[PDB]
Amino acid sequence: MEKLIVAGPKRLARELLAELQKAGVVHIDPLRPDELGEYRLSPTEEAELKRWEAVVSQAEQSLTVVGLATVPSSKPFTGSLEEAEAVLRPVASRAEVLGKERAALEEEIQTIELFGKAAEKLAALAHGLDESPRLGVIPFLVAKPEELEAVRKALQEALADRFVLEAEPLENQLAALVVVKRSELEAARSSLSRLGLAELRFPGAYGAMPLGKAAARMKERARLAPEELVGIREEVARLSRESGEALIALWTRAKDEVARYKAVADMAAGKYGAALMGWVPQKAKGKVEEALGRLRDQIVY
């Protein structure tokens, strides 16, 4: 009834032939890689392949956000590619957005965890002085009160009495701040530089802010973020319950669809040394895909 075309390594020319014969294939004829060119995918079939790959990639991306591993469903999506695509676009877009927001919140909350107390301390140390055009400030961390002195010594060596060095204790280190004439900011920086110290940078948006503003935004994000994350997580959960299983079934159908399309393309590209042709009557058709091999690819009809 239906024509079968099979390709594999040359190593398996014989075991392949054998297994086909005994599965019930008939009129078994070896093919030359040459004559497979005809089974070259049409522009139309290449476009289907590309769309199935996009299904694979969008479902993976969605499952990742949702926190489900890609594990082959027993009952894979059975609809058209159009149906698959129509079911997945809204879900993939929502997952993309949710996953991005959730990550931004988590990174935000962690930033506040790391730099929180430091920004509070420094802001206070620099309250009223942190956006004064005639004065320059430098926040920076220092480990020992002994090290702070060496700095105080350097600074005085360099600026006499034209600076203010104050510091607040952190859990381990000390949050320090220097204040100088704006025009001498670099002289102060140089002093830190010669002691192996540097300005404390705050990550992200906070970097380009005055201490005071930075600490205030951190304080409010610390009140708002944790609850916004809850809401994002509830949306993500809701997406899992509504669509987790469908995604898996889509992924599964699409993984196979891609293999099926590529197999044909690779075969036609003479990417295999051994290739056979044969005819399969409805009954035997069962035993043929069972001798699956895994190193070979067929295409029935």
TrEMBL record:
GO cellular component labels: proton-transporting V-type ATPase, V0 domain; vacuolar proton-transporting V-type ATPase complex
Keyword match Ubl conjugation: no
Swiss-Prot/TrEMBL GO biological process terms: vacuolar acidification
Protein origin, superkingdom: Bacteria
Limits of the V-type ATP synthase subunit I N-terminal domain: 114-202
Metal-binding is among the record's keywords: no
Swiss-Prot/TrEMBL keywords: Ion transport, Membrane, Transmembrane, Transmembrane helix, Transport
Domain Vacuolar ATPase subunit I N-terminal proximal lobe residue range list: 1-52
Localization, UniProt: Membrane
Main location: membrane
GO molecular function, one term: proton-transporting ATPase activity, rotational mechanism
Family: Belongs to the V-ATPase 116 kDa subunit family.
Protein name: V-type ATPase 116 kDa subunit
